[PDB]
C-alpha cells in the first residue's frame, strides 16, 4: 500500500475524536463543536512546543550545546516555540466568536472538567522552569492533584528532570570572558561603573546650586545605589531566596557579558537565544492574559467548573512570579553608557 | 465518576496520531513532527469550517432562513468561518520556520502522498460552490480517492452548494416585484435618464482634447451600466463560467447593496460581505501555500504528481472565486442621486 | 491635476522626523524607528477619534433612534476594533529594537513621555474612563488649548453615557408593556427550587433585582450603567435573535471588544516596557513598569457591566416566553 | 523640556488630513480612513528605506567584511520583514470601507493614484527591481508620473548599487569557493556525479515494475536538473533573459551557506539569506492583498489587470535564493569538512 495523506496524519484518530457531551446527554448544542476543536488544536500545538522544548533541553543535557555548530538549531527551535505561541495567542479570537449565552447552553455538561486538567500545559510550565514556590496558592496544592498513573509519572519527571532554566543557567555560567585569570569581565565592569559614577557625581556637583541640579543629585543617588547593588552577591542570594531572582550570580554575569558584547561573532547567536527566552516568557504571559479577558466575557464573576474563583484566580497568574527568565528582563535595570563597557583588546577579540 | 478534560477531548486519540515516517524507516528527522502537527491542525479547522458551513446550508435548504430571526445565527457562523480562515492563513508562518534543507531530509518518505488527498479541503471547495468544470486543466481531482470517501465527494458535488442556496435566497429579495417597488425597471429608467443628462453637460463644453476624454469616458461608462440590463449577455457569460449567479439573484444582490441601511437589509448586507470575505481568504490561503511551496521545492514537481509551484499558482485566479459576481457589482456602482428613491 | 503626495500632505508627514540624538551630535540609528512607531500610533489614534466622535454625534443628534443608522454605527465601532488589533500587533515592530540600543538614545527623551499624548487621553475620556477611578492629576502634563480640549472631553457626553440613554429607551422594559423585569423576577424565583452550590447561585442571581445594592456599587464606581440601562442590556442579550435586536447585540459585542483591545494595548505596552527599562523609573517621573501594570484592571473597563452580566445567565426555558404580540413589535 | 508632541512633530503629522470631498463642499466620512491608511503606509515605507539604506551602506563601505556587523545587518533585514508583515495586515483596516462608501469620494481623487508614491518606487529600486523587467502601464515607463527632483531621485535609485548587487558581491567572496582552497564547486559536481551513479545502480537492480518504469523517468528528470547547475553557459544566458539575477559565482556562495549553515561563520549569513527571501515573499503578499482589495472596491473598472501582473517572478529580486531548493541533494552527498577548513569557519 502506497502512502496516503489521511493515513500518514492518522486522521482516523484526529477526525474521529469529537464527541459533544450535549449530544451524548440528548441535547446537542452547535457551538460545543467549536469548543472541542479549539482545545484539541491548542493541545496539538502544546505537544509540538514540548517536542521542540524537550529537544533543546536534550542538546544542553547531553553537552552537544558545547559544540557551537548546534546554536543555529537551538535558536531556530526556540524562535519556533515563540512563533507557535504567537499563533496560540491569536487562536483565542476564534473562540471569541462564541457568545457567553451560547456557551451557557452547553457549559453544564462540562462539570467538573476544566483547562486546569491540561497535562501538557503543566508539562510545558514545568519543563520551561516554573517552580512550586512561583505558583499562586490555589494553583500550587491543586495542580498536580488532578492526575494519576502514567499522567502523574510524566508530571513528576517534568518537576524532577533538568528544566530549561537550570540548563541555560549552567551554560551561562561558562560564558567566555568571566574568568578572573582572563578577561575578568566582572572586575573591569565594577571598576568602570565606580569610575563612571565618580565622573557623573563631579559633572552634577559642578552645576550652579539650582533646582534642575537638585533633581539630578537625588536621581544620581538612586542610580548609584542600584548600579553598585549589582556587585553585592549577598543581596543576590537574599533576592534568590524571596524568588525575586532565579539565576545564579554567575549565570547573571554570563547573560550581561552576552548583552554588552552581543556583536562579537561568538555572542551573536547566544544573544538571539537570550532574546527568544524573554519572547517565550512574554508570549506565555500574553497567553494567560488573553485567556483571562475571554473567561471574563464567558463567566463574569462566577466560579469555574474546576472549583476556582474563576476570572480572579486566572488574573493572579498574569504576574512576573510566573516569568521563568524574569532576570533577563531585569538586566535592563543595570544598562550603563556604552563608554563604561570594559573595552576589548586584540587578544580577546580574536577569541 | 466525573468528566475529565483529557477524556472529553479524546486526547487518547488526538495526542497518539503522530508517527514520523522517517522514524518508522530508522532515520528520525526532527522537523517531520512539525509537518504532521501543522496538517493535523489545518484538518481540525477544516472539520470545524464544514460543521459551520453544513449548518448554514441546512438553514437555507429547510426554509429557516425565511424567518429573519435566524439571520444573526447565519451571519455570525459565516463570520466565524472567515475568522478561522484568517488563522489558517497566519498558520503558514509556523511551517515557514522549517528550512527547505531540513524538509529535504524527510521529503522522500512522503512519496507518493500529498494535499490533493485532503478529503476535507475538496468537500469545503465543493460545498461553497467550486464546479468540477472550472478546476484548472490538471485538476480529475477525485481519482486521488476511492471507497466511502469517494461517495462523500459526489454527495458534496450533487447536494445544494452554498452558492445555489444563496442564489435562491437572493431570487426572493423583497423589492424586485415588477408590480411592487419594481427596482429593476426603476434602476434602468434612472441610469438611462442620468446618462442622457450627463451627455447634455458634455455637449455644453468648448470642443477640445479634454472634452474628448469626457466623451470617451462617458461612452465606456454608458456601455457598462447599460449592459447590466442585457439578460441575453448574462446567460451567455453564465455558460462560459464568467458569472455564477442567476440574473434575478444579481438583481437581489444589487438591491441589498443599494438599500443596505434599510433594517431588513442590514444583516443580509453583512452576509454578502462575509461571502466575499470567505472567497478572499480561500484565495489568500492558496497564495500563502504557493509562496511557501516555492521556498520548499523551487520548480521541482510535487510528490502528488503535479509540477508543484507553477500548477498551484494557476489555482490563484477568479476561476475559483465562487462569489465573483458579488465582487463585480462594484463595476456597476452609480451616483447616489440615481438610486431609485424608497 | 491632483497629485498623491499633495493629496496626502506628505510634505508635512515625511518632513516630521527629527532625531534628538542627531540634534545633540551623535545620531543613534534606532531613534528613527522610535519616532515613526509613535507617529503611526498617533495617525491611528486620530482615525479612532474621528470614528468615535461620529458615533457620539449619531447618538447625541437623535439619528440613532432611526434604526437604518444601526449598520453605520456597528460598522464604525467594528472599525475601531480592527484599528486597535493592528495597534496591539504594532508593538512587534518596536520590539525589534533591543533595550541596549534604546538605552543609547533614551537620555535625549527626558523628560518627554506617553503621559503627554493628548490623543490617548481624549480617546480614554471620549469612551468614558472617569478621572476619579484613574490610578495616580494626568492633566498636570497639559497646558494651553490642549488642557481645554481635554477638559471638554470629560464634560461633553461620553460613549458610555450616550449608550446608557439609548439602553434606557430599549423596547420591552415598560412595566405595563411586555414588563421584562417583573417577568424575569417571577421566572428566576419559580425555577430556584432544584454539596448544593444552588445556595450561592440563588444568592447572586436574586441580587440582580436589588436596585439598592446596584445604587451603592454604582456610586462606588464598581458599576457604570444605570439600573434601567442594565435591564436594556440584558433584554438585548436574551432576545438577541429578534430582528430589531440583532444589530444592537452586535453593538454591545463590539463595545466589549473595544474594552478588551484597550486593555490588550495596555498589557502589550507593559510587556515591552518591562524588557526595555526593567524596574527603572520612566522619563516622565513615575515608577514606569509597576504604574503601567495598575492601568491593566477593571478600573479602566468602561463597559465592565456588559462583561459582568455573564454572571446572571440562566437556562433558556426560564427566559420569559415571548408571545405573538411583542414578536410583532420587534419585526422590521 | 522636551514635549512628546513637539518631539514627534505632531504639529505636522496630525495637521496633514484634508478631505478633498470636504474642500469641495460634500464631506464623505470614510475619506478620512483612506487618507490615514496611506499616511501610515508612507511613514512605514520611510522606515523601510531608513533600514534598507543603512544596510546597503554597510555593504558599500566594506564594513560587512567585519563579521561583527552581521548581527546588525540581519536585525535590520528582519525588522523590514516585520514592518512588511504589519503593512500586509494593515489592508484589513481599509477593507472596513465598503465599495458603496468608497464610490461617494472616488471622483474627488482623479487623476492621483498609488502609481505616484515616490517611496514605493525607491523601495522597489533599492531592493533591486530592474526597470527593464517591470510590466509597462499604458505602454510607458513608471517614471512618467514623476518630474523634477522626484524624477532625479528615482534615477539615482536605479543607478546606485541595489541590495541585490551588494549581496551578490559579498556572495562572490564566500569562503570555500577557492579552486585552490576547499574547492566546494568541483567537489560538489564529483559528489553529485557519484550520487546519481550510486542511485542509478539501486534502481536498475529493482524488478521491471510500475516503480522501475516510473523511478527511471523521475531519476532521469532529477539527473538533468542537477547536472544543469554546472552548466555555466546556460546560467549566463538566463541572466540576460532576466530569469536569474545573481552571478554564477554568487549562486555558488549562496549554495555554500545553505549546505554549511550550521558552521559558525555561516549561521548568521544563512539567517540573512532567509530574510532576503522573507522580504521578497512579503512584498509579493503586499501586491496580492492590494489586488484582492482593489477587486472588491472597483471590480473591472484596466488597473486590476496590471496589478495581477505585478504578482509575478519579474518583481522577485532574490528569486535565485528560492530556486536553489531545486538543486538540494541528500545530506550524505554534501562534501565533508576537514580540520583545515572546519577551523577556518570557527569565530
Ligand atoms: C469559554 C472558554 C473558556 C473558559 C470559560 C475557560 C475557563 C477557565 C477557568 C474558569 C479556569 C480556571 C480553573 C477552573 O475554575 O476550572 C481555566 C483554566 C485553564 N484553562 Fe481555560 N477556559 C476557556 C477556554 C480555554 C481554552 C481554549 C484553553 C486552551 C487550552 C484553556 C486552557 C486552560 C488551562 C490550561 C487552564 C489552567 C490555567 C492555569 O492554572 O494557569 N481554556 N479556564
Ligand atoms: C510545507 C511544505 C509543503 C509543500 C512542499 C507542499 C507541496 C504541495 C504540492 C507540490 C502540491 C500540489 C500537488 C502535488 O504535486 O503534490 C500541494 C497541494 C496541496 N497542499 Fe501542500 N505543501 C506543503 C504544505 C501544506 C500544508 C501545511 C497544507 C495544509 C492543509 C497543504 C495542503 C495542500 C492541499 C490541500 C493541496 C491541494 C491544493 C490544490 O489542489 O488546490 N500543504 N502541496
Ligand atoms: C521603548 C518603547 C517604550 C517605552 C520604554 C515606554 C515607556 C513608558 C513608561 C515608563 C511609561 C510610564 C510614564 C513615564 O514614566 O514616562 C509610559 C507611558 C505611556 N506610554 Fe509608553 N513606552 C514606550 C513606547 C510607547 C509607544 C510606542 C506608545 C504609543 C503611543 C506609548 C504610549 C504611552 C502612553 C499613552 C503612556 C501613558 C499611558 C497610561 O497612562 O496608561 N509608549 N511609557
Ligand atoms: C480603495 C483602496 C484602493 C484602491 C481602489 C486602489 C486602486 C489602485 C489602482 C487602480 C492602482 C493602479 C493604478 C491606477 O490605475 O490608478 C493602484 C496602484 C497602487 N496602489 Fe492602490 N488602491 C487602493 C489602496 C492603496 C493603498 C492603501 C496603498 C498604500 C500605499 C496603495 C498603493 C498603491 C501603489 C504603490 C500602487 C502602484 C503599484 C504598482 O505599480 O505595482 N493603494 N491602486
Ligand atoms: O562553545 C561553548 C563555550 C561554552 C559557552 C558556554 N556559554 C556560552 C555563551 C556564549 C558563548 F559564546 C559560548 C559559551 C560552551 O559550553 N560551549
Ligand atoms: O466554566 C468553565 C468551563 C471549563 C473549561 C474551560 N476549558 C475547558 C476545556 C474542556 C473542558 F472539559 C472544560 C473546560 C472551565 O474551566 N470553566
Ligand atoms: O425573510 C425572508 C424574505 C425572503 C428574502 C429573500 N432574500 C432576502 C434578502 C433580504 C431580505 F431582507 C429578505 C429576503 C426570504 O426567503 N426570507
Ligand atoms: O512535495 C510535496 C510534499 C507533499 C506533501 C505536502 N503536504 C503533505 C501532507 C501530507 C503528506 F503525506 C504529504 C504532503 C506534496 O504534496 N508535495
Ligand atoms: O427606534 C428606536 C427604538 C429605541 C431603542 C432604544 N434602545 C434600543 C435598543 C434596541 C432596540 F432594538 C431599539 C432601541 C430608540 O432609541 N429608537
Ligand atoms: O522611559 C521612558 C521613555 C519615554 C517615552 C515613551 N514613549 C515616548 C514617546 C515620545 C517621547 F518623547 C518619549 C517617550 C517614557 O515614557 N518612558
Ligand atoms: O569575514 C569575511 C569573509 C568574507 C565573506 C564574504 N561572503 C561571506 C559569506 C559568509 C561568510 F561567513 C563570510 C563571507 C568577507 O567579505 N568578510
Ligand atoms: O480609484 C482609484 C483611486 C486611486 C488611488 C489609490 N490609492 C490612492 C491614494 C491617494 C490618491 F489620491 C489616489 C489613490 C487609484 O489608483 N484608483
Amino acid at each position: 500500500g502506497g502512502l496516503i495523506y489521511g493515513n500518514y496524519l492518522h486522521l482516523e484518530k484526529v477526525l474521529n475524536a469529537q464527541e459533544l457531551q450535549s449530544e451524548t446527554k440528548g441535547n446537542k448544542i452547535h457551538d460545543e463543536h467549536l469548543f472541542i476543536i479549539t482545545h484539541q488544536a491548542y493541545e496539538l500545538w502544546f505537544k509540538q512546543i514540548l517536542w521542540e522544548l524537550d529537544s533543546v533541553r536534550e542538546i544542553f543535557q547531553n553537552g552537544h550545546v558545547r559544540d557551537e555548530r548546534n546554536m543555529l538549531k537551538v535558536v531556530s527551535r526556540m524562535h519556533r516555540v515563540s512563533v507557535i505561541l504567537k499563533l496560540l495567542v491569536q487562536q483565542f479570537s476564534i473562540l471569541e466568536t462564541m457568545t457567553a449565552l451560547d456557551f451557557n447552553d452547553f457549559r453544564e455538561y462540562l462539570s467538573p472538567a476544566s483547562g486546569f486538567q491540561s497535562l501538557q500545559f503543566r508539562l510545558l510550565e514545568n519543563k520551561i522552569g516554573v517552580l512550586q514556590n512561583m505558583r499562586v496558592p490555589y494553583n500550587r496544592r491543586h495542580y498536580r492533584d488532578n492526575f494519576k498513573g502514567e499522567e502523574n509519572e510524566l508530571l513528576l519527571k517534568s518537576e524532577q528532570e533538568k528544566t530549561l532554566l537550570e540548563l541555560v543557567e549552567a551554560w551561562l555560567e561558562r560564558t567566555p570572558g568571566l574568568e578572573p585569570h582572563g578577561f575578568n569581565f566582572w572586575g573591569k565592569l565594577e571598576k568602570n561603573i565606580t569610575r563612571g559614577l565618580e565622573e557623573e557625581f563631579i559633572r552634577i556637583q559642578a552645576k550652579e546650586e539650582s533646582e534642575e541640579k537638585e533633581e539630578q543629585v537625588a536621581e544620581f543617588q538612586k542610580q548609584k545605589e542600584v548600579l553598585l547593588s549589582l556587585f553585592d552577591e549577598k543581596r543576590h542570594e537574599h533576592l534568590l531566596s524571596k524568588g525575586e531572582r532565579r539565576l545564579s550570580y554567575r549565570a547573571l554575569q554570563g547573560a550581561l557579558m552576552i548583552y554588552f558584547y552581543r556583536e562579537e561573532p561568538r555572542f551573536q547567536v547566544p544573544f538571539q537565544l537570550l532574546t527568544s527566552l524573554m519572547d517565550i516568557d512574554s508570549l506565555m504571559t500574553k497567553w494567560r492574559y488573553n485567556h483571562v479577558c475571554m473567561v471574563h466575557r464567558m463567566l463574569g464573576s462566577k466560579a469555574g467548573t474546576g472549583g476556582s474563583s474563576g476570572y480572579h484566580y486566572l488574573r493572579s497568574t498574569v504576574s512576573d512570579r510566573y516569568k521563568v527568565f524574569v532576570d533577563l528582563f531585569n538586566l535592563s535595570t543595570y544598562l550603563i553608557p556604552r563608554h563604561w563597557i570594559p573595552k576589548m583588546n586584540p587578544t580577546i577579540h580574536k577569541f
Side-chain angles (χ1 to χ4, degrees), chain A residues 1-147 149-208 210-221 223-349 351:
Chain A
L3 187 58
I4 307 156
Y5 182 90
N7 302 340
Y8 177 58
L9 298 180
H10 285 286
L11 296 183
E12 77 286 339
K13 300 200 175 160
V14 173
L15 309 191
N16 289 317
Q18 284 76 42
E19 188 183 326
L20 284 69
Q21 274 309 294
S22 72
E23 205 175 336
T24 289
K25 314 286 96 175
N27 183 30
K28 177 159 135 188
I29 310 305
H30 176 78
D31 281 9
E32 170 172 11
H33 198 285
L34 179 67
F35 188 86
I36 286 155
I37 289 283
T38 300
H39 282 95
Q40 291 176 320
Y42 274 112
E43 289 288 337
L44 284 172
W45 286 121
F46 292 164
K47 180 156 178 178
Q48 182 70 38
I49 294 170
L50 286 169
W51 179 268
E52 301 300 340
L53 181 50
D54 282 335
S55 89
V56 168
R57 287 182 48 252
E58 247 309 91
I59 285 164
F60 281 85
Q61 245 173 335
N62 73 14
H64 288 191
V65 70
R66 301 164 165 290
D67 177 0
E68 280 167 23
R69 292 184 62 271
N70 298 314
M71 278 302 298
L72 180 59
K73 178 178 293 182
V74 174
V75 167
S76 159
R77 292 181 188 174
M78 287 317 284
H79 175 245
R80 176 182 293 165
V81 167
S82 68
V83 171
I84 297 170
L85 283 168
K86 223 166 282 219
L87 189 80
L88 297 190
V89 168
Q90 289 168 336
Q91 197 171 283
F92 279 113
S93 72
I94 287 173
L95 194 58
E96 256 150 8
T97 64
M98 173 164 80
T99 77
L101 298 133
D102 289 299
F103 178 45
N104 200 42
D105 294 330
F106 72 92
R107 198 199 166 191
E108 77 190 81
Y109 308 117
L110 292 176
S111 243
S114 78
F116 227 88
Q117 286 161 65
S118 182
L119 175 54
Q120 277 189 139
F121 192 73
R122 297 311 179 201
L123 298 191
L124 173 64
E125 283 177 310
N126 294 338
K127 280 166 182 291
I128 296 174
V130 165
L131 295 175
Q132 59 193 142
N133 295 170
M134 297 170 61
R135 294 183 171 277
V136 139
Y138 183 87
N139 199 233
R140 211 196 295 196
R141 42 185 211 262
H142 283 301
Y143 95 86
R144 32 180 290 92
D145 82 6
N146 285 304
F147 300 103
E150 277 143 71
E151 291 201 341
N152 195 67
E153 174 63 344
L154 285 169
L155 187 34
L156 291 172
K157 273 151 135 205
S158 80
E159 267 224 271
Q160 280 169 14
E161 296 168 0
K162 290 296 203 177
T163 70
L164 189 72
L165 179 58
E166 289 168 293
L167 295 170
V168 163
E169 178 178 71
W171 165 77
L172 276 180
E173 278 173 6
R174 312 188 294 274
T175 308
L178 293 197
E179 310 95 6
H181 198 239
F183 185 64
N184 196 29
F185 164 58
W186 213 235
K188 291 204 172 76
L189 184 69
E190 175 158 38
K191 181 152 299 200
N192 287 3
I193 285 165
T194 301
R195 196 202 60 153
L197 288 164
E198 273 157 19
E199 290 153 357
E200 193 69 27
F201 187 55
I202 280 155
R203 186 193 57 70
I204 292 166
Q205 274 288 68
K207 302 175 66 137
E208 334 98 89
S210 80
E211 286 286 338
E212 155 146 350
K213 146 167 183 184
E214 276 290 9
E215 311 257 302
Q216 302 221 256
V217 33
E219 185 191 25
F220 169 85
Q221 283 299 325
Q223 177 75 333
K224 173 216 179 120
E225 177 176 11
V226 159
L227 273 180
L228 295 208
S229 67
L230 188 48
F231 300 92
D232 180 356
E233 183 158 1
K234 274 179 283 283
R235 213 219 178 196
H236 189 70
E237 258 137 59
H238 182 236
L239 286 187
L240 227 48
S241 305
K242 289 210 293 190
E244 285 187 45
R245 311 212 189 153
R246 316 205 206 280
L247 278 183
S248 80
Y249 195 56
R250 176 157 180 170
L252 214 69
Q253 297 181 24
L256 201 33
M257 175 88 194
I258 288 157
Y259 277 25
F260 292 154
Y261 302 112
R262 63 188 176 284
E263 283 195 297
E264 294 312 299
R266 270 183 79 210
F267 285 150
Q268 285 178 359
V269 180
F271 181 70
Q272 283 178 345
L273 169 59
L274 289 193
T275 292
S276 284
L277 297 179
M278 280 182 286
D279 290 342
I280 288 165
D281 260 357
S282 178
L283 280 156
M284 284 304 293
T285 317
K286 283 153 154 199
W287 184 100
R288 287 173 200 290
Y289 195 51
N290 277 225
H291 178 240
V292 153
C293 281
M294 179 179 60
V295 171
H296 197 205
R297 202 184 319 236
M298 294 292 176
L299 298 189
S301 324
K302 279 204 295 185
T305 58
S308 93
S309 54
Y311 168 60
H312 275 101
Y313 154 68
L314 296 173
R315 231 188 147 68
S316 69
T317 66
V318 186
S319 163
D320 296 335
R321 70 186 304 169
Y322 278 97
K323 287 203 191 196
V324 169
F325 289 105
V326 66
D327 295 322
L328 294 182
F329 289 85
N330 281 347
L331 281 175
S332 289
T333 309
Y334 308 105
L335 301 188
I336 52 173
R338 291 228 329 281
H339 159 245
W340 305 10
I341 310 261
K343 293 290 142 71
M344 289 229 144
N345 61 305
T347 333
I348 182 68
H349 255 279
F351 196 65

